[PDB]
Design a protein around this motif. Structure first.
Motif, PDB file in Angstrom:
ATOM      1  N   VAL A   1       0.829  -1.176   0.000  1.00 55.06           N
ATOM      2  CA  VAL A   1       0.000   0.000   0.000  1.00 55.06           C
ATOM      3  C   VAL A   1       0.896   1.270   0.000  1.00 55.06           C
ATOM      4  CG1 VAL A   1      -1.787   1.293   1.311  1.00 55.06           C
ATOM      5  CG2 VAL A   1      -1.754  -1.252   1.332  1.00 55.06           C
ATOM      6  N   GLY A   2       0.583   2.255  -0.837  1.00 50.78           N
ATOM      7  CA  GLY A   2       1.293   3.510  -0.845  1.00 50.78           C
ATOM      8  C   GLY A   2       0.495   4.555  -0.052  1.00 50.78           C
ATOM      9  N   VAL A   3       1.174   5.377   0.739  1.00 51.63           N
ATOM     10  CA  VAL A   3       0.564   6.493   1.408  1.00 51.63           C
ATOM     11  C   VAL A   3       1.221   7.641   0.710  1.00 51.63           C
ATOM     12  CG1 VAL A   3       0.521   7.834   3.613  1.00 51.63           C
ATOM     13  CG2 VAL A   3       0.081   5.358   3.619  1.00 51.63           C
ATOM     14  N   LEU A   4       0.426   8.580   0.186  1.00 55.63           N
ATOM     15  CA  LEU A   4       0.937   9.547  -0.780  1.00 55.63           C
ATOM     16  C   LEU A   4       0.562  11.017  -0.513  1.00 55.63           C
ATOM     17  CD1 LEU A   4       2.640   9.193  -3.360  1.00 55.63           C
ATOM     18  CD2 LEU A   4       0.509   9.350  -4.644  1.00 55.63           C
ATOM     19  N   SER A   5       1.533  11.927  -0.452  1.00 56.63           N
ATOM     20  CA  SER A   5       1.164  13.315  -0.529  1.00 56.63           C
ATOM     21  C   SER A   5       2.201  14.015  -1.366  1.00 56.63           C
ATOM     22  CB  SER A   5       1.117  13.950   0.842  1.00 56.63           C
ATOM     23  OG  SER A   5       0.594  15.286   0.815  1.00 56.63           O
ATOM     24  N   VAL A   6       1.731  14.888  -2.258  1.00 57.65           N
ATOM     25  CA  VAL A   6       2.591  15.478  -3.256  1.00 57.65           C
ATOM     26  C   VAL A   6       2.410  17.018  -3.206  1.00 57.65           C
ATOM     27  CG1 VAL A   6       3.189  15.404  -5.730  1.00 57.65           C
ATOM     28  CG2 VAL A   6       2.384  13.305  -4.640  1.00 57.65           C
ATOM     29  N   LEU A   7       3.457  17.775  -3.519  1.00 53.99           N
ATOM     30  CA  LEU A   7       3.367  19.212  -3.688  1.00 53.99           C
ATOM     31  C   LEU A   7       2.853  19.591  -5.107  1.00 53.99           C
ATOM     32  CD1 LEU A   7       6.515  20.428  -1.821  1.00 53.99           C
ATOM     33  CD2 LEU A   7       4.483  19.307  -0.892  1.00 53.99           C
ATOM     34  N   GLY A   8       2.181  20.739  -5.220  1.00 54.87           N
ATOM     35  CA  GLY A   8       1.508  21.144  -6.481  1.00 54.87           C
ATOM     36  C   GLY A   8       2.415  21.546  -7.647  1.00 54.87           C
ATOM     37  N   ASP A   9       3.710  21.727  -7.423  1.00 52.40           N
ATOM     38  CA  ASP A   9       4.584  22.047  -8.546  1.00 52.40           C
ATOM     39  C   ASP A   9       5.226  20.812  -9.196  1.00 52.40           C
ATOM     40  OD1 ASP A   9       5.997  21.812  -6.219  1.00 52.40           O
ATOM     41  OD2 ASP A   9       7.836  22.718  -7.098  1.00 52.40           O
ATOM     42  N   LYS A  10       4.763  19.612  -8.842  1.00 56.39           N
ATOM     43  CA  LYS A  10       5.455  18.405  -9.293  1.00 56.39           C
ATOM     44  C   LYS A  10       4.735  17.863 -10.476  1.00 56.39           C
ATOM     45  CE  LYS A  10       8.417  18.791  -6.128  1.00 56.39           C
ATOM     46  NZ  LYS A  10       9.428  19.840  -6.268  1.00 56.39           N
ATOM     47  N   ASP A  11       5.403  16.972 -11.229  1.00 56.10           N
ATOM     48  CA  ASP A  11       4.708  16.140 -12.271  1.00 56.10           C
ATOM     49  C   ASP A  11       3.912  15.030 -11.543  1.00 56.10           C
ATOM     50  OD1 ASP A  11       3.845  14.556 -14.379  1.00 56.10           O
ATOM     51  OD2 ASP A  11       5.805  14.528 -15.423  1.00 56.10           O
ATOM     52  N   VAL A  12       2.774  15.419 -10.987  1.00 59.29           N
ATOM     53  CA  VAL A  12       1.968  14.499 -10.181  1.00 59.29           C
ATOM     54  C   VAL A  12       1.589  13.206 -10.913  1.00 59.29           C
ATOM     55  CG1 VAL A  12      -0.264  14.247  -9.015  1.00 59.29           C
ATOM     56  CG2 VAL A  12       1.168  16.399  -8.804  1.00 59.29           C
ATOM     57  N   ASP A  13       1.158  13.373 -12.158  1.00 56.46           N
ATOM     58  CA  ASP A  13       0.794  12.284 -13.024  1.00 56.46           C
ATOM     59  C   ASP A  13       1.939  11.318 -13.349  1.00 56.46           C
ATOM     60  OD1 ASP A  13      -1.277  11.195 -14.948  1.00 56.46           O
ATOM     61  OD2 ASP A  13       0.544  11.535 -16.317  1.00 56.46           O
TER      62      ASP A  13
ATOM     63  N   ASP B   1      -0.526  -1.981  -4.785  1.00 52.72           N
ATOM     64  CA  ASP B   1      -1.854  -2.625  -4.885  1.00 52.72           C
ATOM     65  C   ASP B   1      -2.938  -1.600  -4.600  1.00 52.72           C
ATOM     66  OD1 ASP B   1      -1.324  -5.683  -5.220  1.00 52.72           O
ATOM     67  OD2 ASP B   1       0.147  -4.940  -3.658  1.00 52.72           O
ATOM     68  N   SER B   2      -2.749  -0.768  -3.575  1.00 55.09           N
ATOM     69  CA  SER B   2      -3.554   0.427  -3.488  1.00 55.09           C
ATOM     70  C   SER B   2      -2.710   1.601  -2.974  1.00 55.09           C
ATOM     71  CB  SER B   2      -4.876   0.173  -2.721  1.00 55.09           C
ATOM     72  OG  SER B   2      -4.631  -0.246  -1.383  1.00 55.09           O
ATOM     73  N   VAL B   3      -3.299   2.783  -2.957  1.00 57.77           N
ATOM     74  CA  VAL B   3      -2.618   3.946  -2.501  1.00 57.77           C
ATOM     75  C   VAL B   3      -3.648   4.666  -1.587  1.00 57.77           C
ATOM     76  CG1 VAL B   3      -3.411   5.402  -4.499  1.00 57.77           C
ATOM     77  CG2 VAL B   3      -1.228   5.903  -3.285  1.00 57.77           C
ATOM     78  N   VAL B   4      -3.210   5.235  -0.461  1.00 55.95           N
ATOM     79  CA  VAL B   4      -4.116   6.044   0.361  1.00 55.95           C
ATOM     80  C   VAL B   4      -3.649   7.478   0.148  1.00 55.95           C
ATOM     81  CG1 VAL B   4      -4.874   6.472   2.753  1.00 55.95           C
ATOM     82  CG2 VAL B   4      -4.159   4.215   2.097  1.00 55.95           C
TER      83      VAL B   4
ATOM     84  N   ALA C   1      -5.005  10.466  -8.933  1.00 51.16           N
ATOM     85  CA  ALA C   1      -4.744   9.058  -8.565  1.00 51.16           C
ATOM     86  C   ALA C   1      -5.782   8.100  -9.155  1.00 51.16           C
ATOM     87  CB  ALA C   1      -4.671   8.911  -7.043  1.00 51.16           C
ATOM     88  N   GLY C   2      -7.046   8.526  -9.216  1.00 55.93           N
ATOM     89  CA  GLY C   2      -8.149   7.697  -9.703  1.00 55.93           C
ATOM     90  C   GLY C   2      -8.024   7.427 -11.212  1.00 55.93           C
ATOM     91  N   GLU C   3      -7.548   8.432 -11.966  1.00 56.49           N
ATOM     92  CA  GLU C   3      -7.357   8.389 -13.412  1.00 56.49           C
ATOM     93  C   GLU C   3      -6.255   7.400 -13.825  1.00 56.49           C
ATOM     94  N   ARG C   4      -5.453   7.046 -12.850  1.00 57.76           N
ATOM     95  CA  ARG C   4      -4.247   6.253 -13.001  1.00 57.76           C
ATOM     96  C   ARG C   4      -4.483   4.895 -12.348  1.00 57.76           C
ATOM     97  NH1 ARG C   4      -0.993   5.329 -16.353  1.00 57.76           N
ATOM     98  NH2 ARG C   4      -0.367   7.241 -17.471  1.00 57.76           N
ATOM     99  N   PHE C   5      -4.962   4.869 -11.110  1.00 58.28           N
ATOM    100  CA  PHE C   5      -5.159   3.602 -10.405  1.00 58.28           C
ATOM    101  C   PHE C   5      -6.517   2.951 -10.660  1.00 58.28           C
ATOM    102  CE2 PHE C   5      -1.693   2.582  -7.362  1.00 58.28           C
ATOM    103  CZ  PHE C   5      -0.869   3.667  -7.550  1.00 58.28           C
ATOM    104  N   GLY C   6      -7.497   3.741 -11.087  1.00 55.19           N
ATOM    105  CA  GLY C   6      -8.861   3.303 -11.026  1.00 55.19           C
ATOM    106  C   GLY C   6      -9.394   3.683  -9.663  1.00 55.19           C
ATOM    107  N   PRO C   7     -10.658   4.143  -9.593  1.00 53.88           N
ATOM    108  CA  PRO C   7     -11.245   4.636  -8.353  1.00 53.88           C
ATOM    109  C   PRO C   7     -11.173   3.682  -7.141  1.00 53.88           C
ATOM    110  CG  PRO C   7     -12.958   4.033  -9.950  1.00 53.88           C
ATOM    111  CD  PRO C   7     -11.638   4.113 -10.689  1.00 53.88           C
ATOM    112  N   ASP C   8     -11.360   2.375  -7.349  1.00 52.52           N
ATOM    113  CA  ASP C   8     -11.403   1.413  -6.230  1.00 52.52           C
ATOM    114  C   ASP C   8     -10.061   1.034  -5.572  1.00 52.52           C
ATOM    115  OD1 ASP C   8     -14.438   0.503  -6.452  1.00 52.52           O
ATOM    116  OD2 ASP C   8     -13.620   0.550  -8.507  1.00 52.52           O
ATOM    117  N   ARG C   9      -8.933   1.517  -6.104  1.00 48.98           N
ATOM    118  CA  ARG C   9      -7.630   1.276  -5.472  1.00 48.98           C
ATOM    119  C   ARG C   9      -7.109   2.563  -4.793  1.00 48.98           C
ATOM    120  NH1 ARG C   9      -3.809  -0.434 -10.229  1.00 48.98           N
ATOM    121  NH2 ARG C   9      -2.286  -0.616  -8.550  1.00 48.98           N
ATOM    122  N   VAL C  10      -7.981   3.555  -4.682  1.00 53.49           N
ATOM    123  CA  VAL C  10      -7.631   4.837  -4.071  1.00 53.49           C
ATOM    124  C   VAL C  10      -8.460   5.042  -2.818  1.00 53.49           C
ATOM    125  CG1 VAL C  10      -7.584   7.361  -4.383  1.00 53.49           C
ATOM    126  CG2 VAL C  10      -7.059   5.805  -6.374  1.00 53.49           C
ATOM    127  N   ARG C  11      -7.807   5.363  -1.696  1.00 55.19           N
ATOM    128  CA  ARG C  11      -8.507   5.804  -0.509  1.00 55.19           C
ATOM    129  C   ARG C  11      -7.967   7.171  -0.130  1.00 55.19           C
ATOM    130  NH1 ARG C  11      -8.814   0.816  -0.784  1.00 55.19           N
ATOM    131  NH2 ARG C  11     -10.625  -0.478  -0.194  1.00 55.19           N
TER     132      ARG C  11
END
Ligand SMILES: Nc1ncnc2c1ncn2[C@@H]1O[C@H](COP(=O)(O)OP(=O)(O)CP(=O)(O)O)[C@@H](O)[C@H]1O
Ligand SMILES: [Co+2]
Ligand SMILES: [Co+2]
Ligand SMILES: [Co+2]
Ligand SMILES: [Co+2]
Length: 442
Positions: free
Chosen positions: A337-349, A360-363, A382-392
């Motif tokens: 499981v990934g726990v994720l927080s990103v800053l707004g100037d990054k290549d988030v995608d 397997d999922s990301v929170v 994250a949803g556009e990349r993982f699919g909605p059901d692997r994102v919390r």
């Protein structure tokens, strides 16, 4: 209370490209950044790591080091180190007080016909602390770019350029070569033997820009995969064992307590840099001793096992993709499981795409920085990349780790599914999580 003073200083600094202001400041300080030689480091990824590795190797050769790195994970004190250790909250406040009268003077003169920035002040503090200590050698990481970076007032005899790629995003199309040109501005003409430029793996358009600045400074060049290289690499309990070709010879059975092929490349870069600096053959017992003493807090650092928790400061796609390869190749995780927080100037995608085949999922969450991406904006990405059901989602880092934990609990209890949590996306996310596992700044 040393701590009250430390917060009090941080608060003033937080209320704040030429080299005019930082130059005038250094002149007023008596030019302390010219009273010792420096190894100066720029690049997109690995600068901090390489800086720490360099510090460890020079310390293993028994010279006193000063090291300034950025950004900090947990505490500003980490920005200024002496002998491999952050200075104390008292010494940092003291270093700030000692230079403040001259900073005020630069603020006022500049306003009488733009105050100094926070980074300019921090740099001045590190340089002045180095002279106060005093040190034999300084290892100096660039804050941003290089040509007009506050640190670029040192005329370093060794200039190291680690791999260059996308990090901070202003455009979609990449001006790879305008980015390279600004970093190479740390390669300057020597006053006394020629500047050595030590360059990691680059794409050809970068290589060509670095080479031509090196020419303009009449600078000797040492490039990875021509003048030095990682010859052999073997995964080990805690890290890896390296066989490295430096400038002066082959060095074998180097134990490096860090994971990731990328850290093998940082190591051999740090080695060529220290050989370049001392003119190398370096004593191999010292190289081995230095590499074994290396730490790099918040870079694939294991907080605990059962379940296994890693913090990693990956905040760009090349970093994210180095994180994913290491997780897949040097471990055997059945569930992550990934726990994720990103800053707004990054290549988030690009980060999310690099990590999707391993998580397997990301929170997703908010790391408490004012520059962080809001939870909703990150969950959509994250949803556009993982699919909605692997994102919390979770409101903050401690909740996000609670959600991830029970996901690893549920998976542990699922026979057809060696589990872990990886906290990443930002230096600030790895630093906040490191403080939650109770670790001291390092
Ligand atoms: N040579 C390299 N190539 C690819 N990724 C690397 C790398 N060196 C480090 N990384 C990745 O980059 C993240 C940041 O490493 P550091 O070693 O911290 O880079 P850095 O100083 O250039 C920028 P920052 O210190 O702002 O995080 C690491 O956690 C790791 O995921
Ligand atoms: Co850094
Ligand atoms: Co910008
Ligand atoms: Co021996
Ligand atoms: Co099942």
């Amino acid at each position: 209370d040393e701590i009250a003073s430390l917060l009090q200083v941080e608060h003033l600094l937080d209320q704040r490209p030429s080299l005019t202001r930082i130059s005038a400041l250094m002149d007023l300080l008596g030019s302390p950044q010219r009273s010792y030689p420096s190894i100066h480091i720029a690049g997109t990824n690995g600068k901090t790591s390489v800086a720490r590795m360099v510090d460890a190797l020079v310390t293993a050769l028994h010279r006193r080091t000063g090291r300034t790195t950025s950004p900090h994970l947990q505490s500003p004190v980490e920005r200024i180190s002496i002998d491999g250790k952050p200075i104390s909250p008292a010494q940092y406040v003291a270093t700030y007080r000692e230079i403040e009268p001259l900073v005020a003077l630069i603020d006022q003169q500049s306003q009488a016909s733009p105050a100094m920035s926070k980074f300019e002040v921090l740099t001045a503090m590190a340089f002045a602390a180095f002279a106060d200590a005093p040190v034999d050698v300084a290892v100096v990481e660039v804050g941003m770019g290089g040509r007009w970076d506050a640190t670029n007032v040192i005329n370093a005899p060794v200039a190291v350029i680690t791999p260059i790629s996308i990090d901070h995003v202003d455009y979609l199309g990449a001006d790879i070569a305008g980015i390279a040109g600004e970093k190479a501005g740390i390669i300057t003409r020597a006053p006394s033997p020629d500047t050595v430029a030590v360059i990691g793996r680059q794409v050809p358009k970068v290589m060509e820009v670095l080479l031509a600045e090196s020419v303009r400074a009449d600078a000797s060049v040492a490039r990875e995969d021509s003048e030095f290289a990682v010859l052999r690499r073997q995964i080990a309990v805690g890290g890896q064992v390296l066989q490295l070709q430096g400038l002066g010879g082959v060095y074998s059975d180097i134990y490096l307590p860090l994971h990731g092929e990328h850290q093998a490349h940082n190591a051999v870069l740090a080695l060529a840099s220290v050989e370049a600096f001392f003119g190398a053959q370096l004593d191999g017992d010292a190289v081995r001793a230095g590499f074994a003493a290396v730490t790099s807090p918040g870079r694939l650092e294991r907080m605990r096992s059962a379940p296994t928790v890693f913090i990693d400061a990956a905040h760009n796609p090349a970093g994210a993709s180095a994180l994913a390869q290491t997780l897949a190749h040097e471990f055997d995780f059945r569930f992550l499981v990934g726990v994720l927080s990103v800053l707004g100037d990054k290549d988030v995608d690009g980060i999310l795409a690099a990590l999707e085949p391993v998580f397997d999922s990301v929170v997703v969450t908010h790391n408490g920085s004012p520059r962080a991406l809001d939870v909703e904006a990150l969950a959509l990405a994250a949803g556009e990349r993982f699919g909605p059901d692997r994102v919390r989602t979770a409101e903050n880092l401690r909740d996000a780790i609670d959600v991830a934990t029970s996901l690893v609990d549920d998976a542990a209890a699922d026979p057809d599914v060696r589990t872990g949590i990886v906290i990443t996306g930002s230096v600030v996310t790895a630093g906040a999580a490191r403080t939650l596992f109770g670790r001291d700044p390092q």
